[PDB]
Design a protein around this ligand. Structure first.
Ligand code: ADP
Ligand code: MG
Lengths: 75, 371, 70, 70, 188
């Protein structure tokens, strides 16, 4: 015996409408996430600029100290 | 309470609670036992990794899909997949939730009866209902007519519907689908030197197919162009380096859909089985079916298929009718979105197969009025 | 990126909607104009038949004076 | 980039083209509908006056028939 | 239709060559049920109907209630979606269009022919159906000769062997004078 669908009333072509309506909401949330993400990630470039200044000063320090040790060792 | 809209599929299991927009957990349906010996003690090595866990340890597993062509060939593995889906990907005990499975058209009865028997005895759900995978895809489009071509990964079927009245004599089910395209791509890649054999490397070939292949608008012109210039050769990096370059294998793999003679199948392509499915319908609803042709399923996501199919059907169909092909961007999950919509309806709330009904008539209840 | 793709999809969906509405409007306009020109031909034919009936009436109005003369 | 801007602009332009085309077709449909309604309203009266002329012909033919047969 | 309902057990025949195998299954196994509902009920409880058949390569198959459901389409063309009435009711309609005085003779001399009328048990189902439709007084008789398949050709041989028929042929000179449209003319 085939399944006889009972008596309903509606609906059509509306739930798809409301579901597709939130495309603007999705676009806004995605673009907001992208903007805030780039803004909160580019600061690592400045952090690595700090890393570069630290490596430059440590390299100068090590050059000076190794020259000092070469001076104080070769008797 | 809320209903569980599971959708077994063949290749990706998609599940989630009724009333949402997208499935909560989507993961390949593969169960892979380890094949080597194993020397580390106490590593906590399990005997079978299922779901998305076996797509990360696939280097030492032998993945095997439990669903071949719509039908289920290995019931223990399918039970394991369902148990994983319920308990670990959704974390909701099935004792308190109705379920809405999906099934391809024209499938063996025993498959459906065993499915309902498992759901009622092992997982012990309150009530489950089985629905045809094409009606849901028609729900999701918000239509009520139209002929839907649901080219999944297991089987491609083409169910025409008018005004809500399905036409059972016009369903054309063809067993060419994404898996055969993966095998054919893996077979034509050998013409350049790349050999993929292991069942784990089938996944790599599937990734190549997804990311690179596209459907040509005109086949002969593309074959001529790819044989003279080199503007098509796109490269791809394997999981270990050694990039590969795909030439005219790009549009030859998905061309099998429109010429199933490539893999030795006799039948006509998906461009001509739709026209045949239409012509079996009555003479007065052919215009509406022509104007509301719906695409669904994963395999219909190839870039440029909604134009090739329209060109082919326009060639076949009478010149006066307008041919329109609905290709929503959410094609892959169209069946599941439709399933959620159907499960969320109030009119549908009394069609579930309640457990007491199953206790009175046995598993053969599914073929009865509660379809 | 990602949201740019969503914007691209949306900016084509409305294009498809507009094209569909344009096709529907073109078909309706052509059908209506064809019906109007057919009704124009009908009115011309009706005028011709009215003229022919008036000619026959002129004949059968010329006849009575001769009949009275008979 | 560069192609994105012009592609989006072209899509918007074609959407507007379709909208204006549909509006023009709708206006033509309204004009055709008005023309058809006006044509029918007067064509009914044309048929009525044709019938009146036919009845006048019938009587102006019955009279000469009798007069000749008189 | 048989090839389409066999898929309910797992056997899929698709190739145009396998249509011949399904035709052989239909010829050797299918039969027309005397009463459809009783057979559907019996085949769903017992297992006395399941007859097996060996494919051209082994792997025997077992046909259950597909046996009498395939040829039942003749009496209920709604199975394959056709609107019209079965062969049991188009015969009665064809009789009722005839004149009122030759209906008894047509009732008594109903003839079956053609290949498809060779199903075991059709000459009884059709008689039962027509007796249900027809008035109770008329006698319904169904002529089902054992040489049903070649009945048309045997009749053709008899007609060609007649002396009275020897001048009805469309002679070639006649065709040369009137063209191919001669067939619709007196030489029918
Ligand atoms: N973006 C894509 N491009 C091309 N092919 C795809 C894409 N995504 C998925 N596929 C193919 O579709 C299959 C998934 O289909 P799916 O709709 O999940 O099947 P099912 O109906 O079993 O859920 C994959 O095996 C893959 O081959
Ligand atoms: Mg699917």
């Amino acid at each position: 015996v085939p399944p006889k669908i009972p008596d309903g009333e509606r609906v059509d072509f509306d739930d798809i409408h409301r579901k597709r309506m939130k495309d603007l909401n999705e676009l806004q949330t995605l673009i907001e996430a992208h903007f805030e993400n780039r803004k909160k990630e580019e600061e690592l470039v400045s952090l690595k600029d700090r890393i570069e200044k630290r490596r430059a000063e440590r390299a100068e320090q090590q050059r000076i100290r190794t020259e000092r040790e070469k001076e104080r060792q070769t008797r | 309470t809320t209903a569980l809209v599971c959708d077994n599929g063949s290749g990706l299991v998609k599940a989630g609670f009724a009333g949402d927009d997208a499935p909560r957990a989507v993961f390949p349906s593969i169960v892979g036992r380890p094949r080597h010996q194993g020397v580390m003690v106490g590593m906590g090595q399990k005997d079978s990794y299922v779901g998305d866990e076996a797509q990360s340890k696939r280097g030492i597993l032998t993945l095997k899909y439990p669903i071949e062509h719509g039908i289920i060939t290995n019931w223990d593995d399918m039970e394991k997949i369902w148990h994983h889906t319920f308990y670990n990907e959704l974390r909701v005990a099935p004792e308190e939730h109705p379920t809405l499975l999906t099934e391809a058209p024209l499938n063996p009865k025993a498959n459906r009866e065993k499915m309902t028997q498992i759901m009622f005895e092992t997982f012990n759900v309150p009530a489950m209902y089985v629905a045809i995978q094409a009606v849901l895809s028609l729900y999701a489009s918000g239509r009520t007519t139209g002929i839907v071509l649901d080219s999944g990964d297991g089987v491609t079927h083409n169910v025409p519907i008018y005004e809500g009245y399905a036409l059972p004599h016009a369903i054309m089910r063809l067993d060419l689908a994404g898996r055969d395209l993966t095998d054919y791509l893996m077979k034509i890649l050998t013409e350049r030197g790349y050999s993929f054999v292991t069942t784990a490397e089938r996944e790599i070939v599937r990734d190549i197919k997804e990311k690179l292949c596209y459907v040509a608008l005109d086949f002969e012109n593309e074959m001529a162009t790819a044989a003279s210039s080199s503007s098509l050769e796109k490269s791809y990096e394997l999981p270990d380096g050694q990039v590969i370059t795909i030439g005219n294998e790009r549009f030859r793999c998905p061309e099998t859909l429109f010429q199933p003679s490539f893999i030795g199948m006799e039948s006509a392509g998906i461009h001509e089985t739709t026209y045949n499915s239409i012509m079996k319908c009555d003479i007065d609803i052919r215009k509406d079916l022509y104007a509301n042709n719906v695409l669904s399923g994963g395999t219909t996501m190839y870039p440029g298929i909604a134009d090739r199919m329209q060109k082919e059907i326009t060639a076949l169909a009478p010149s006066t009718m307008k041919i329109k092909i609905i290709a929503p961007p959410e094609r892959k999950y169209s069946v599941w979105i439709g399933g959620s919509i159907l499960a969320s309806l109030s009119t549908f709330q009394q069609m579930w197969i309640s457990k007491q009904e199953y206790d009175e008539a046995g598993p053969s209840i599914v073929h009865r009025k509660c379809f | 990126m990602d949201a740019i793709k969503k914007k691209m999809q949306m900016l084509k969906l409305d294009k498809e909607n507009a094209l569909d509405r344009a096709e529907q409007a073109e078909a309706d306009k052509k059908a209506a104009e064809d019906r109007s020109k057919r009704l124009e031909d009908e009115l011309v034919s009706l005028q011709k038949k009215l003229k022919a009936t008036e000619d026959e009436l002129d004949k059968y109005s010329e006849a009575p004076k001769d009949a009275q003369e008979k």
